[PDB]
Design an enzyme around this catalytic site. Structure first.
Site, PDB file in Angstrom:
ATOM      1  N   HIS A  65      72.523  85.878  22.879  1.00  0.00           N
ATOM      2  CA  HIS A  65      73.816  85.967  23.945  1.00  0.00           C
ATOM      3  C   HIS A  65      74.738  86.058  23.166  1.00  0.00           C
ATOM      4  O   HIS A  65      75.967  85.898  23.757  1.00  0.00           O
ATOM      5  CB  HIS A  65      73.424  85.294  25.206  1.00  0.00           C
ATOM      6  N   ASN A 138      69.620  84.887  33.864  1.00  0.00           N
ATOM      7  CA  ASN A 138      69.570  86.170  33.713  1.00  0.00           C
ATOM      8  C   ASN A 138      69.880  87.160  34.831  1.00  0.00           C
ATOM      9  O   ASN A 138      69.606  86.773  35.772  1.00  0.00           O
ATOM     10  CB  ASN A 138      68.364  86.508  32.798  1.00  0.00           C
ATOM     11  N   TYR A 352      69.538  73.700  23.737  1.00  0.00           N
ATOM     12  CA  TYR A 352      71.123  74.023  24.099  1.00  0.00           C
ATOM     13  C   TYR A 352      71.908  72.783  23.678  1.00  0.00           C
ATOM     14  O   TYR A 352      73.193  72.928  23.305  1.00  0.00           O
ATOM     15  CB  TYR A 352      71.330  74.178  25.685  1.00  0.00           C
TER      16      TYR A 352
HETATM   17  C1  HEM Z   1      64.484  81.383  31.720  1.00  0.00           C
HETATM   18  C2  HEM Z   1      64.620  81.514  30.171  1.00  0.00           C
HETATM   19  C3  HEM Z   1      65.939  81.755  29.783  1.00  0.00           C
HETATM   20  C4  HEM Z   1      67.212  82.018  30.373  1.00  0.00           C
HETATM   21  C5  HEM Z   1      67.416  82.333  31.852  1.00  0.00           C
HETATM   22  C6  HEM Z   1      68.297  82.238  29.133  1.00  0.00           C
HETATM   23  C7  HEM Z   1      69.381  82.319  29.319  1.00  0.00           C
HETATM   24  C8  HEM Z   1      70.438  82.108  28.246  1.00  0.00           C
HETATM   25  C9  HEM Z   1      71.971  82.468  28.543  1.00  0.00           C
HETATM   26  C10 HEM Z   1      72.368  83.224  29.879  1.00  0.00           C
HETATM   27  C11 HEM Z   1      72.444  82.305  27.517  1.00  0.00           C
HETATM   28  C12 HEM Z   1      73.970  82.314  26.976  1.00  0.00           C
HETATM   29  C13 HEM Z   1      75.015  81.331  27.731  1.00  0.00           C
HETATM   30  C14 HEM Z   1      76.228  81.879  27.388  1.00  0.00           C
HETATM   31  O1  HEM Z   1      76.516  82.737  28.102  1.00  0.00           O
HETATM   32  O2  HEM Z   1      76.783  81.519  26.662  1.00  0.00           O
HETATM   33  C15 HEM Z   1      71.602  81.601  26.566  1.00  0.00           C
HETATM   34  C16 HEM Z   1      71.812  81.167  25.209  1.00  0.00           C
HETATM   35  C17 HEM Z   1      71.076  80.300  24.656  1.00  0.00           C
HETATM   36  N1  HEM Z   1      69.522  79.980  24.674  1.00  0.00           N
HETATM   37 FE1  HEM Z   1      68.588  80.660  26.469  1.00  0.00          FE
HETATM   38  N2  HEM Z   1      67.552  81.673  28.122  1.00  0.00           N
HETATM   39  C18 HEM Z   1      66.302  81.377  28.387  1.00  0.00           C
HETATM   40  C19 HEM Z   1      65.412  80.864  27.426  1.00  0.00           C
HETATM   41  C20 HEM Z   1      65.745  80.194  26.246  1.00  0.00           C
HETATM   42  C21 HEM Z   1      64.534  79.347  25.577  1.00  0.00           C
HETATM   43  C22 HEM Z   1      63.129  79.224  25.832  1.00  0.00           C
HETATM   44  C23 HEM Z   1      65.370  78.641  24.600  1.00  0.00           C
HETATM   45  C24 HEM Z   1      64.973  77.715  23.526  1.00  0.00           C
HETATM   46  C25 HEM Z   1      63.912  76.791  23.717  1.00  0.00           C
HETATM   47  C26 HEM Z   1      66.815  79.349  24.695  1.00  0.00           C
HETATM   48  C27 HEM Z   1      67.835  78.737  23.800  1.00  0.00           C
HETATM   49  C28 HEM Z   1      68.935  79.231  24.051  1.00  0.00           C
HETATM   50  C29 HEM Z   1      70.165  79.062  22.900  1.00  0.00           C
HETATM   51  C30 HEM Z   1      70.009  78.117  21.852  1.00  0.00           C
HETATM   52  C31 HEM Z   1      71.342  79.726  23.343  1.00  0.00           C
HETATM   53  C32 HEM Z   1      72.814  79.600  22.467  1.00  0.00           C
HETATM   54  C33 HEM Z   1      73.542  78.521  23.571  1.00  0.00           C
HETATM   55  C34 HEM Z   1      74.833  78.370  22.774  1.00  0.00           C
HETATM   56  O3  HEM Z   1      75.098  78.619  21.751  1.00  0.00           O
HETATM   57  O4  HEM Z   1      75.783  77.722  23.674  1.00  0.00           O
HETATM   58  N3  HEM Z   1      66.874  80.216  25.525  1.00  0.00           N
HETATM   59  N4  HEM Z   1      70.291  81.516  27.199  1.00  0.00           N
END
Ligand code: HEM
Ligand code: HEM
Ligand code: HEM
Lengths: 678, 677, 309
Positions: A65, A138, A352
């Site tokens: 993202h 999402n 996160y």
């Molecule tokens: C239902 C499943 C998921 C949804 C709805 C989702 C949604 C999101 C969203 C909206 C962001 C961006 C947040 C922003 O705008 O700064 C993000 C970033 C991120 N996601 Fe998820 N994601 C999902 C699954 C996962 C999974 C399974 C993992 C790891 C096990 C993951 C790890 C991360 C990481 C490391 C970031 C970057 C956060 C940061 O740098 O601040 N995501 N995700």
């Protein structure tokens, strides 16, 4: 003002002299040198402190993202929801809580285009009086995979090939379709991303979902399973792929500019927060497991209950300090909410928090102004890179006689502490497995596909056809077809046509004809056309321009954003033909007289590329937009073979045109202009 | 309050519930577990946010001067100094400016002992209304090397050997003395470090120096070469080595506690800021080059002008946030001050800015509360790790029509901007050389040594004997003797005795008999004895304790800090014999009756190590302290073979003892107790 | 040679010309100046590449056990222990595995004295042919606390007071004893640290302990509870406190130099690896819970069984 608390960190440089970062007025436009044409001196402290700061401006982009934009706003509870949750932001009618929301794509790096086809992020922070609570969601209600440990696998496969770093912000390549077909859980999210959800008109025209089942918990410790929904008050809308592609080049910032402009124009977008609420005993009651994030719960089994409303009404002042630096986490939870044993959600909790260490280069990122809660931080944490506070309590440990027990423990009964749902239990062996209840990867993609309009279904088929045809490996293409066939034989057959392959024979195991409401985009008209954009094609010769001014004035009084286009920036002209493109507009109208630029000498100015006005009208028509021509400008419609009688095509006088265009903008896309198989 | 601006970032947790770092009240004493004796859950967000912050507490220590302590205070100008400098903080009589000062050793890591032998840092920040001005100095007026490019060589050589990381906080190893003899410029600072300056009694009892020649510049651009001096109002005082060693073990925190306690007790230390001012045309007129940081300017040639006074009167509230995080730079300069072409200073300008990128892991370290100026920051810098502000000006560049020219350029004539000294010129070829004016490495070390008292000279000699005897390589020791012999044949001969070597034949080239005032320590008695420590050796038996309490009260009225010591913590006892050591005190007094613990079984309670009371008195005497015994307690003195008639030894009635001890404390160390060759 | 694998990253500078970190021979004893007594030039790339590297030499010290020293060596199995564990390094008699061991105190920062009174670390890495296996142990068999969430509280309390950062490398202050008395689980480790274990004669004269009960698992998936022990072949020895204090000032490096010198003189120290083995059904058989790291298992209930050296 939702940004009120940020005012104390705002810095105004108007009317001031330039300074170093340690104070002291300076000039900084000339390096200090040894002689008139001499070398720069190391003792130029001014040069080094200015360039050092510049050299170090960048921080790592989000691992996913990376590309996105956000805004501040206010959430208002419609009720006292204490009967379902202890959560304070939901504890009283009309109660207001500041929010910040960031919308995004997933795969693309930071400067990739808004209108790439991708899942979209919709992340919301509530700065509540009992801590920051984030719903990190999402614009699609289901995710690709069922266990968080597979996240690097999914993401590696969709992001660029690691040898050449191609392709940017696209799933249209071998590794992605290899993974989707090798890991069939991915098929449901894939179908959503191949629909209009993959290429939305704007952030404002998206719904949002928390995806995971969470728990709402009351003071007494009783829980209910919950799904979070954000329902857009602007209505859902999507582009077409051939349009989205051109828009990616003409304006990579289409969505971030759309959000920014709507807020500055006083057209703050809103969403209702709604929930589905079910008893714990319903976890496996609806033909799938509610711990499985690759399924959604059909509204027919549990209707949306609206809890409140969020309106985004303030842009940031500094994009980097606010939007880029904000650090969301599903682990940001408050009293009244709890996790479930969703194996995807479980791993997110770890990821996160950990990833902030990389992005912010230290442990004190919660102290950043955009990340700070409004509710007070009191604990025994100390030190760390960039420590911004000075702690008064020298007895920084618990338990302790010397600090008299402060800061004190809070729990379910004292101090409104967080508490895990009391009835939650663990049973059975430790295991590296998933439940067999997770095994059906095909029924719900079929449900989704069944619930779209026929042209919407074609768009999904055509997205898959486009993407899968980029896959070089023949066996991977065959693997994709085998997997699609388990969902729908018809889909597989129609995709196989583009690939020049034979689809496998029908496999009826998972086929069904069930449908569910609310997953379609194009099937419902928009509830408002406010902010929608009208490109008015005019000309500097004759009387077109004055009539275009009149058209514009009327359209704007009805909430529309109008751009008057002509050959050069004459008075009343908003944009030149050289700078114009149909992708920028929701409707295209030819002002009377402007027909002169569609044929003959008027079409051959060196002020714009050959055919430009014709191309804008052509693009507008073929991409399904309302298109129109006032009076003699019907000649322009005739020049491109478009007939006045067609749906979404309007001719006649300014009054008939305005009324027709405004009604067409509610329909938004005229799907009859798109061919369907057979 | 000097810390006034820091109040807004102070965080009081009294009367509050525990929270996470993102708000929300919590408990955090049990991990969340799956079942009664079950495994810890990954979903325990409370556990992970707490431990993650703990796990990431440490930041790199300073590459040099890692071990140190600081405090806040106020600097007050004695005058309007505008005729010599445009510097705002010196611009009017009685003008006050907040300061922070950090004192330090050089070689040791963060937890090494305060009383290691070393050069000491004395770094001062003035939070002026025209930017932060730092004088980053030492307690010795000359530095080891003449060109900043050689700093890593010097520093690698004195710090621990890189194979085994031995020895900690010490130059007593082969590589250091290899460097000192291979790079003769080092000899001057070496002599200072081998004198009392290497083992000061406390930070409060050090002078400070900017070392380099800088420039003071008036509004009209007229310049003077300048040396900065800090003159302690507490007086200079130093330990003896055999004492400093034991102290390094008994209390590694001796200096930081001393500073903390003086400030808390309302005995804030002061220093006067003074300068030597030199005409530009006389930079090379005093027998050396003023661009050479291995030389100092004898005060006979240029006396001190006293500019004002700084008093350190507030301890920090959080050591890490304030003392550990503060980032000094010689590049922190303000209008009215300029650099010179001192090749050592020149390279520092680069190095202190750069090193902050390592220590603070980003470019916004000037935004930390302890580093922020009080005068306001307005520029087009944006972003960077940890950006703590939100900038309003979206036209973050110059020149620009859209920002109306703000923030605006400031120079010599407009907006009181910094300006380099008008008339500084460059001339000649680009070179990687050093002027030949830098070539004499021996005359000033000899001048320094000449200017010490005979016992102070013996101290320098014995420090070199101790250190050089640790050198394992025979030729390195010979190299050292050869260099010392160029300074003084007597020094070389006297050092050579300890090493069992033959000192080279006299080499008269650099020998001379010149002397200079003010580089000595033990010769002048202290200006005050306030804060000095008296250890009163008593006993829980009989009436000794009651007499100790009365002794304590008189002494305290006179401004001393008194510790009454006994076998155990009875009423009025401040410290047990088990916890006590002579190193903690400036004087040692045996109360009447306590002579009982100096022999027999009285000297071997299970409550303290055998002989402890006698050892304290013995240590105190042999280290040159005022020692005393009231009434029948002179038996204690007799037990260790010390006579009442000796200088700095006082016996008799209480009144007599108190008078005696208080006079002895002014002399501080009795040097006749130390043999000379 | 236990360090054999490290040879390929060793850099020899004997007989070589000085270079920058990007190659190219240089001199680097004089800054480049504009004139004889001139200012240093920004274009002196040599000066900056050298000082920049110096400026950035330090990394953060370990949050605990910052003060310490180590050595390489070889572990030898005395037997094929496949009947108690599938672990490769214990899988055959005479099988050798390279190790590295770091010994340490706990509270003090990097420059603090070896002979401070403290718990001591004893961390061993086995570089086995099936991955790195670390026994991260102490010289005392029990720990102050029963739940890891309390570690910051324990450590804050024993480390220097956060206002003045006093005292270095010592538990002899209010906050520590406030914690020991407020959190009585701490009493057992406290007693050990107040004994000779707090002031050992050398690293070579310490036993070591994994503290926790772990499991040994055989190929078939059957498990046994296990306590890891290192038994010094040099014997246990300790100083007395009044001696340890003087030594802290006279030679802060006493323990690290002792280990260095012993290895250099060909007197390499040895420890036998030994285990206590407990059936799963006896986890709570011995008057306490073997999941509780504040108790040890008396040798009377489970003799030490030596596995190797
Ligand atoms: C239902 C499943 C998921 C949804 C709805 C989702 C949604 C999101 C969203 C909206 C962001 C961006 C947040 C922003 O705008 O700064 C993000 C970033 C991120 N996601 Fe998820 N994601 C999902 C699954 C996962 C999974 C399974 C993992 C790891 C096990 C993951 C790890 C991360 C990481 C490391 C970031 C970057 C956060 C940061 O740098 O601040 N995501 N995700
Ligand atoms: C006249 C000669 C020198 C003096 C008086 C001096 C003094 C000091 C002092 C007092 C400190 C500690 C500041 C504090 O308490 O935080 C310090 C640190 C430091 N010095 Fe110097 N020094 C000298 C030479 C040099 C040179 C030639 C260099 C490099 C070219 C250098 C590089 C450094 C660095 C990198 C630090 C660490 C600063 C930080 O991490 O904040 N020093 N010096
Ligand atoms: C039975 C209890 C424990 C033992 C035997 C133990 C032992 C050790 C040892 C020997 C080291 C130093 C390793 C080295 O030489 O580099 C160390 C470091 C460390 N310990 Fe522990 N410790 C224990 C408890 C804990 C707990 C409860 C925590 C936190 C939950 C913890 C966190 C750490 C951390 C963060 C380090 C720094 C490691 C590094 O930076 O590489 N320890 N411990």
């Amino acid at each position: 003002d939702a940004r009120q608390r940020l005012k104390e960190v705002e810095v105004d440089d108007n009317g001031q002299f330039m300074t170093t970062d340690f104070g002291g007025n300076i000039e900084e436009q000339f390096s200090l040198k040894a002689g008139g044409r001499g070398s720069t001196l190391l003792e130029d402290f001014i040069f080094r402190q200015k360039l050092q700061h510049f050299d170090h401006e960048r921080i790592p982009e989000r691992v996913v993202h990376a590309r996105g934009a956000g805004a501040h706003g206010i959430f208002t509870s419609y009720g006292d929801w204490s009967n379902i949750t202890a959560a304070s932001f939901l504890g009283a009618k009309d109660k207001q809580t500041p929010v910040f929301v960031r919308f995004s794509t997933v795969a693309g790096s930071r400067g990739s285009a808004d209108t790439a086809r991708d899942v979209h992020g919709f992340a919301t922070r509530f700065y509540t009086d009992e801590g920051n609570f984030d719903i990190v969601g999402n614009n699609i209600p289901v995710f690709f995979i069922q266990d968080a440990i597979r996240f690097p696998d999914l993401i590696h496969s969709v992001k660029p090939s690691p040898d050449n770093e191609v392709p940017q912000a696209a799933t249209a390549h071998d590794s992605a379709w290899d993974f989707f077909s090798s890991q069939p859980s991915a098929l449901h999210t894939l179908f959503w991303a191949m629909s209009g959800n993959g290429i939305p008109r704007s952030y404002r025209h998206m719904d949002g979902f928390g995806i995971h089942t969470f728990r709402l918990v009351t003071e007494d410790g009783k829980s209910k399973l919950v799904k979070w929904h954000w329902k857009t008050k602007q209505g859902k809308a999507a582009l077409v792929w051939e349009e989205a592609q051109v828009l990616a080049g003409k304006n990579a910032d289409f969505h971030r500019q759309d959000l920014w402009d709507a807020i500055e124009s006083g057209n703050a977008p809103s969403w209702e927060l709604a929930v589905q609420l079910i008893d714990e005993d319903k976890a496996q009651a609806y033909g799938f497991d509610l711990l499985d994030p690759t399924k959604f719960l059909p509204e027919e089994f549990a209707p949306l209950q609206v809890l409140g409303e969020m309106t985004l009404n303030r842009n940031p002042m500094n994009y980097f300090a606010e939007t880029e630096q904000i650090s969301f986490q599903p682990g940001h939870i408050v009293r009244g909410v709890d996790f479930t044993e969703d194996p995807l959600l479980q791993g997110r909790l770890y990821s996160y928090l950990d990833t902030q260490l990389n992005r912010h280069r230290g442990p004190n990122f919660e102290q950043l102004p955009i990340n700070r809660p409004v509710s007070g931080v009191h604990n025994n944490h100390r030190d760390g890179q960039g420590q911004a506070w000075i702690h008064k309590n020298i007895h920084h440990y618990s338990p302790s006689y010397l600090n008299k027990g402060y800061p004190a423990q809070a729990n379910q009964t004292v101090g409104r502490g967080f508490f895990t749902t009391p009835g939650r239990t663990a049973s059975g062996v430790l295991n590296r497995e998933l439940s067999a209840t997770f095994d059906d990867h095909y029924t719900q993609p079929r449900l989704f596909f069944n619930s779209l309009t026929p042209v919407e279904q074609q768009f999904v088929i055509n997205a898959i056809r486009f993407e899968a045809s980029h896959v070089t490996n023949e066996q991977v293409k065959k693997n994709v077809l085998e997997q699609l066939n388990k969902i729908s034989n018809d889909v597989a057959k129609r995709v196989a046509v583009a690939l020049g392959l034979e689809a496998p024979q029908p496999d009826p195991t998972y086929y069904h004809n069930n449908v569910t409401r609310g997953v379609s985009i194009f099937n419902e008209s928009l509830p408002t056309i406010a902010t929608l954009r009208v490109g008015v094609l005019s000309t500097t010769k004759g009387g077109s321009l004055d009539k275009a001014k009149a058209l514009k004035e009327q359209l704007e009084k009805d909430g529309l954003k109008v751009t008057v286009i002509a050959e050069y920036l004459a008075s009343g002209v908003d944009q030149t033909y050289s700078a114009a493109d149909a992708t920028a507009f929701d409707a295209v109208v030819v002002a009377e007289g402007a027909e002169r630029v569609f044929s003959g000498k008027g079409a051959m100015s060196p002020l714009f590329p050959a055919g430009r006005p014709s191309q804008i009208l052509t693009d507008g028509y073929r991409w399904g937009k309302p298109v129109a021509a006032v009076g003699s400008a019907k000649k322009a419609l005739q020049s491109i073979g478009v007939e006045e009688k067609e749906a979404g095509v309007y001719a006649g006088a300014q009054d008939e045109v305005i009324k027709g265009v405004e009604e067409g903008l509610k329909v938004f896309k005229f799907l009859e202009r798109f061919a369907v198989d057979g």
